[PDB]
């Protein structure tokens, strides 16, 4: 159990099983620490300066530069080992055909990119529902005779609405962040083995 | 004329007349420099560090700490002199009953706060129009007989729309920036003579 920071960050036995190791058997050691590295990072100029140093303390944490240059080596092995397992499905990861669990780079690829908002709005294969709290019939009051589509699926968003929603969302996103014209180039310029400062000045130009 | 940076920032003879001096007679000297101090500032951690130093060069700029501690004194006189003229209309400036010209603290107070977006949407005195490009009648196709309101003012936004617009705008603003509960306290805590670092740690608490 050691210094139980699992609870001090609010985690569980089915959460750390997915993150790293555990395997539905809470009580190898090197591996489990990874399941809290990106967690501080998800949950900048002055931050990352003291984010590493926060988990560096725990490295020390019965039952220095000792582990600062020994465990930190194991990081660079297992991230490039899985990144070579990620290069074997890179098309799935660009198309977004993947179940990325919240603050969790544990994955499982799927036939259609279900969890892409911009896919769901901009696709003509399947009906898109909303809450059962909205009557989206529009000509409801002029329907003296109801079909099965009326009865069970009065909650379906129509094309005119699906397009209005998508255009609100991107009008919004365009205000806060910046657009990436070269979708594939930007993705491939970062998914490579090259150093953080290498592509730093390269990506900026694209923008 | 000297080093004509008027044109290098794209200004004019009717723009500098309003900003400071000029008086529709382009060719006292101390005063006109003010009409370019806030202009670099409108058009942060690393910026203000080198914004002042940019106009400090021009102080030097025929026909040191010489003017760094002599003209910069004239700044603190004329800004607290007008700020005592602004305290005589502070209610107008909080209610937003004022014509603040773009990147220009030249003013002229007005009977109703016309240039407040959130006023225009949330007021029941005057009709609010939009472009002549939108037919906002809704029951237009069921109107075999047209009134004067129909004919000349088919472009009027109705309450249900004015409220939807206001709620989109604030749902948006709530995402980017933070809300100020104490509207009057926040305004008065900054409109005072006290030093920039004084209220710096005081305002943060309110948030």
């Amino acid at each position: 159990i050691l210094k139980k920071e699992r609870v001090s960050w609010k985690l569980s036995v089915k959460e750390l099983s997915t993150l790293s190791g555990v395997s539905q058997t809470y009580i190898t050691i090197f591996n489990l620490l990874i399941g809290f590295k990106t967690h501080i990072e998800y949950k900048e100029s002055p931050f990352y300066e003291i984010n590493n140093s926060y988990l560096d303390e725990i490295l020390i944490m019965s039952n220095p530069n000792e582990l600062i240059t020994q465990f930190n080596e194991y990081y660079d092995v297992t991230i490039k080992k899985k990144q070579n397992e990620n290069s074997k499905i890179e098309s799935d990861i660009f198309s977004n055909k993947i179940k990325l669990v919240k603050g969790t780079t544990k994955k499982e690829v799927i036939e259609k990119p279900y969890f892409d908002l911009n896919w769901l709005l901009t696709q003509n294969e399947y009906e898109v529902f909303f809450d059962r709290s909205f009557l989206l019939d529009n000509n409801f009051l002029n329907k003296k005779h109801f079909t099965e589509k009326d009865m069970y699926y009065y909650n379906v968003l129509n094309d005119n609405d699906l397009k209005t929603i998508k255009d609100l969302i991107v009008v919004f996103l365009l205000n806060k962040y910046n657009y990436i014209k070269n979708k594939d180039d930007f993705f491939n310029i970062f998914t490579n083995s090259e150093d953080d400062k290498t592509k730093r000045d390269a990506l900026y130009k694209i923008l | 004329i000297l080093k004509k940076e008027r044109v290098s920032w794209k200004l004019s003879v009717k723009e500098l007349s309003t900003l400071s001096g000029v008086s529709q007679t382009y060719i006292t000297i101390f005063n006109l420099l003010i009409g370019f101090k806030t202009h670099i500032e409108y058009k942060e951690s690393p910026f203000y560090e080198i914004n002042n130093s940019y106009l400090d060069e021009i102080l030097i700029m025929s026909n040191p700490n010489e003017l760094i501690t002599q003209f910069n004194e004239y700044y603190d006189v004329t800004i607290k002199k007008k700020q005592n003229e602004n305290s005589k209309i502070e209610s107008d400036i909080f209610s937003n009953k004022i014509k603040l010209v773009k990147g220009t603290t030249k003013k002229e107070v007005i009977e109703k706060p016309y240039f407040d977006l959130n006023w225009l949407l949330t007021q029941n005195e005057y009709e609010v129009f939009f472009d002549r490009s939108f037919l906002l009648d809704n029951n237009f196709l069921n109107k075999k007989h047209f009134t004067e309101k129909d004919m000349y003012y088919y472009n009027v936004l109705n309450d249900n729309d004015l409220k939807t617009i206001k709620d989109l705008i604030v749902v948006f603003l709530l995402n980017k920036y933070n809300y100020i509960k104490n509207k009057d306290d926040f305004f008065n805590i900054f409109t005072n003579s006290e030093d920039d670092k004084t209220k710096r740690d005081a305002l943060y608490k309110i948030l």
């Binding site: 920071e5 001090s8 501080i40 949950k43 926060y54 988990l55 | -």
Partner: peptide
Amino acid sequence: KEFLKIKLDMYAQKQKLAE
């Protein structure tokens, strides 16, 4: 006075609520 550990062992042990 543990005014950060409840507002946001490790992190406590050493612009977070400005978001």
